[PDB]
Structure to design on (1163 residues):
């Protein structure tokens, strides 16, 4: 093995921001790098547009105008004075012409067209792909360094098959017979806790395989280190009748051979305006610009030597996804956790070794959910106990594995839901059905019969899960997966290790999080950190179907390789670094299995048949472009609008699906501007009050008002107009799904911001604030 | 129908007749998470174990009290008005329909005492919304 | 009545089906969803006997049918009045088959008899 | 004229008091449950030995919606 | 603002001086796809290509 691409699965997220480096973001290449970065800008800013426009200026432009100034505006009057400003690739050229017909007056006239298109736009999160030279074992050592005459050529082929694939009712693997993995317990299938449902086809009126091929969008392209021009990945729907161009993404390669992959613009649409997307997942007549596919490369060196990066051990994949609306807020269980769990078998979790750095991510991610979900701000007894420990600089007690601390550790561990799903149940027919004795999540279809009172407390976290469709099933609610619950159980029991250096940096959770963040940033294995960073920000449950990807990812059958390599640091595991690659069909878009299905429906029996890699059905795991994302909701916007709260008859805690990436309760900018400042601030308005009123008040009173404002959390669905605005607006669930198609790009984006002098108010120095146009 | 009328601007939220048909209330559940002083000799203090509540700094204890005091609930969410359950539609019209049966389960606001607010900023008299859902 | 081709060539695959009234959990509580009644009549008395149950079972009275026996020993079974109703007026039956919170007076069951001649 | 036949339904002679009066298959019913029901010694064979309510339980509730 | 072209009609004149007026193609549309026209007469955010207006002419004979 000679050269290898990293990451093995790249991720790019859609946004209406432009596909240019200064105005875009990059998928994390190091976990936890930017958790407290209060200068982050995930929306396009006025400053950014001003600079890009100033940098488009002269160029000789500023006196090729003066040239024109004394010569008097007509047509090539202005077409000359375009071009000099290379802005055609950001704004359609005529709108630029419309701009100058109605007249430093040129700067303002073109800044307003840029602002109309891009101001406050959701920036695209692009993925950098790197080539690494390997070893005698194939271990990455260093990024490829091109010398004179060396050339890298990348190839990308992607597709979207959502409109071609099957309905998503629930995860088919919930009925798949197994011995159990690190991600999913044998009990779910064995005891029928959440049976897999059959699924009919999407767009069922398109019949015969050959006509259904039109439902698949696909495109490809190539770029080289000899030319940094961007190449669009453009397909058509219906594919080859009136047709729509679908920008699935864009690719760039720079001087040093790095591939930058931009996702699409976030455009979803029906073939007829009256076909509304009223279902969370399955909407006929719709297409979106999500895609996924195969990334390969060829390295040509000065010496004629040529190396092909196309095998599945050194090739890569790319998938595009909905935006991340809280990029610094990490899912409690990530897709990288699924990769790690997929390589473990449930019965060998006895042999698992636990450090405190394997347990800390669970507690840290949960603690930070307070910024996106109300229940974790004010209804989570573990987050409150962590606050109690921080108050007295006593968080380090949790790192104590001795007997004097067992009851402290156990008290926290016992609040977590056990992924065996065999606790808090009563059995009928010990034919056995496991019926939860804790709080159930009812169906909307009500029955006026007295609910059975819950005898068992609700465990953590307070999120729905794969079995939501079945009231009374333990799998209605989310559990950290078996291998992570084992880590926590080892922690509680005292069978864990930790270093003294860690203890000394563990007086508060934030201090230790900053310490562990530094361990990532100084870990020398950049190829494997980049593989992990691309996935540590993606959700890993529940899957109904999820946010970015769904349940095939939690099975080892989807990987051609999945190996433990190393701790993040020699002495600190932090859940580990792994070499993993996806199973790939090496023919890509030209695979004979590109357009395969299972007939009128898909069912778990089809998945059962696919386990055997020699079977006819094994193509299910050997991914062709489009295969990773076809399971998800079409369009993704209606799935996002459905990925929010699920209310119970009991008001609190409010269950939330995926709040780390699609927040539910946020802290608006409006509130930030009412607790930002201290009473001493040299400002005519302080926290929304006149200087005189703000300083005429007691200090206690001033600080109390800060905290009240800080305490006001806003439903994320209300950060834009999702059908609830206006006199007699209907609001409600279904209007949210319809309106999200246009309003996704106006939803609030959560961003770390400073509080420079919190005083005694109780407000942390770093807060996470939701910016939108309506909540300012 | 006598509740909030939302504008494109988030704040302030317009309300019709909130003095008699409240729009945002302070639930019982929150009241039980701020009415106790750290001094209380109970196994549960403001929704926390005795050990946790007394182990934190007094500063922190009072801040948690005021955070709870500041959580206001949509009055229409104080009983099941069509928004409860997996894939519940919710929305304006289901509120009109369900109120026929649910008016009698809507939260009722009543003055309640806070014996020792200390330095929390909570007034000695609060007005708390009682309903079966929000308790 | 049905060709093997339907199953063999997967012409119309059977679909999984969830429970009606799924918020009623545990078999014991789900017994409340079943409406039942019984009765007996004789040749010696022509009086009609109603078959009346309750929903939810042990609230609304549900007349599932009526039975009679004339002096010649022939049984006459009348069905219900065609009354269907939700437990709450706002629960509307918008699905062709599966509407939670609804009962009707349809039924079916077991018909037995015993003959008793004069010679004992 | 298509003939005359003697036929009888399978019945549970305990009727309302049968121990299978209230049996089901858990959270869903599927064809695998009907496959197992063919074996007369299975835990599922009760599907074919009718107790009161067993013939009409499949039909629409209420019947009026199914008729429309 | 994102604007739509609306063909309200077409006009021809032949060599005999006859004006021929064609109406539009029948295209109606909302400014947003989700704005549905559920009222018989009053639907906000819609436009159609119906029109009406004024017809005038000028006759110019050989003798000026
Ligand atoms: Mg996030
Ligand atoms: Mg009043």
């Amino acid at each position: 093995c000679q050269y290898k691409i990293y990451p093995p699965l790249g991720i790019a997220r859609v946004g209406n921001g432009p596909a240019i480096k200064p105005l875009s973001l990059s998928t994390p290449e190091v976990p936890w790098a930017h958790l407290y970065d209060t200068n982050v800008q995930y929306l396009v800013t006025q400053q950014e547009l001003e600079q890009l426009l100033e940098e488009a200026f002269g160029g000789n432009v500023i006196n090729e105008i003066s040239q024109i100034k004394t010569k008097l505006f007509k047509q090539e009057e202005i077409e000359t004075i375009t071009g000099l400003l290379g802005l055609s690739h950001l704004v359609p050229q005529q709108q630029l012409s419309r701009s100058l017909d109605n007249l430093q007056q040129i700067k303002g006239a073109l800044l307003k067209v840029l602002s109309d298109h891009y101001l406050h736009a959701v920036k695209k999160q692009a993925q950098n792909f790197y080539i690494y030279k390997c070893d005698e074992q194939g271990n990455p050592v260093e990024k490829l360094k091109l010398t004179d005459g060396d050339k890298v050529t990348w190839r990308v082929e992607v597709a979207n098959k959502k409109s071609f694939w099957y309905d998503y009712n629930n995860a088919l693997d919930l009925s798949l017979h197994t011995q159990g993995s690190g991600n999913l317990s044998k009990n779910v299938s064995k005891h029928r806790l959440a049976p897999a449902m059959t699924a009919k086809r999407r767009n069922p009126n398109v019949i015969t395989n050959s006509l259904r091929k039109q439902l698949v969008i696909s495109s490809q392209g190539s770029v080289s280190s000899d030319n940094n021009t961007q190449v669009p990945l453009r397909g058509k729907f219906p594919a080859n009748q009136e047709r729509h161009n679908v920008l699935q993404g864009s690719i760039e390669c720079d001087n040093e051979g790095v591939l930058r992959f931009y996702a699409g613009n976030g455009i979803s649409q029906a073939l007829s305006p009256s076909s509304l997307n009223t279902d969370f997942a399955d909407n006929s007549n719709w297409f979106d610009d999500i895609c996924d596919g195969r990334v390969t490369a060829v390295v040509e060196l000065k010496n004629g030597d040529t190396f092909e990066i196309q095998d599945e051990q050194s090739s890569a994949w790319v998938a595009t996804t909905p935006p991340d609306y809280a990029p610094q807020i990490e899912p409690i269980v990530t897709m990288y956790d699924m990769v790690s769990g997929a390589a473990l078998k449930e019965q060998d979790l006895d042999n698992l070794t636990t450090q405190f750095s394997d347990v800390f991510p669970i507690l840290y991610r949960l603690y930070r959910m307070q910024w996106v979900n109300q229940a974790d701000f004010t209804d989570n007894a573990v987050n409150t106990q962590i606050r109690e420990l921080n108050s007295e600089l006593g968080f380090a007690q949790l790192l104590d594995n001795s007997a004097s601390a067992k009851s402290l550790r156990e008290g926290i561990f016992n609040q977590f839901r056990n992924p065996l799903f065999d606790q808090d149940i009563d059995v009928d027919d010990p034919s056995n059905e496991w019926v939860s004795n804790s709080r159930i999540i009812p169906s909307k279809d009500e029955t006026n019969i007295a609910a059975k009172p819950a005898t068992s407390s609700l465990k953590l976290p307070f999120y729905p899960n794969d079995g939501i469709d079945y009231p009374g099933s333990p799998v209605q609610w989310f559990a950290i997966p078996p291998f992570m619950y084992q880590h926590l159980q080892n922690w509680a029991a005292g069978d864990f290790s930790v270093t003294q250096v860690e203890k000394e940096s563990a007086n508060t959770i934030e201090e230790l999080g900053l310490f562990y963040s530094e361990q990532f940033k100084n870990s020398p294995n950049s190829a494997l950190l980049c593989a992990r960073g691309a996935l540590d920000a993606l959700y890993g449950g529940g899957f109904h179907p999820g946010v970015e990807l769904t349940w095939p990812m939690r099975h080892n059958l989807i990987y051609s390789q999945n190996d433990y390599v190393s701790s993040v640091t020699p002495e600190i595991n932090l859940l580990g670094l792994r070499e993993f690659r996806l199973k790939q069909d090496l023919q890509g878009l030209n695979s004979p299995n590109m357009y395969q299905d299972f007939g009128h429906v898909i069912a778990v029996d089809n998945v059962t048949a696919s386990i055997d890699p020699n079977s006819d059905a094994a193509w299910l795991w050997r991914s062709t472009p489009g295969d990773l994302t076809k399971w998800m909701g079409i369009p993704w916007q209606s799935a996002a609008a459905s990925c929010q709260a699920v209310y119970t008859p009991e008001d609190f805690p409010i269950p939330s699906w995926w709040a780390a990436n699609l927040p539910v309760h946020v802290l608006p900018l409006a509130r930030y501007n009412k607790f930002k400042d201290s009473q001493s601030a040299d400002l005519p308005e302080i926290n929304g009050m006149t200087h005189s009123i703000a300083q005429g008040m007691s200090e206690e009173t001033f600080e109390h008002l800060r905290l009240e404002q800080f305490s006001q959390r806003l439903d994320w669905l209300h950060t834009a107009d999702l059908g609830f605005v206006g006199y007699h607006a209907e609001g409600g669930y279904t209007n949210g799904l319809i309106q999200m198609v246009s309003q996704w790009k106006n939803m609030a984006m959560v961003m770390a911001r400073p509080v420079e002098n919190p005083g005694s108010s109780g407000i942390p120095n770093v807060v996470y604030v939701a910016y939108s146009q309506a909540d300012k």
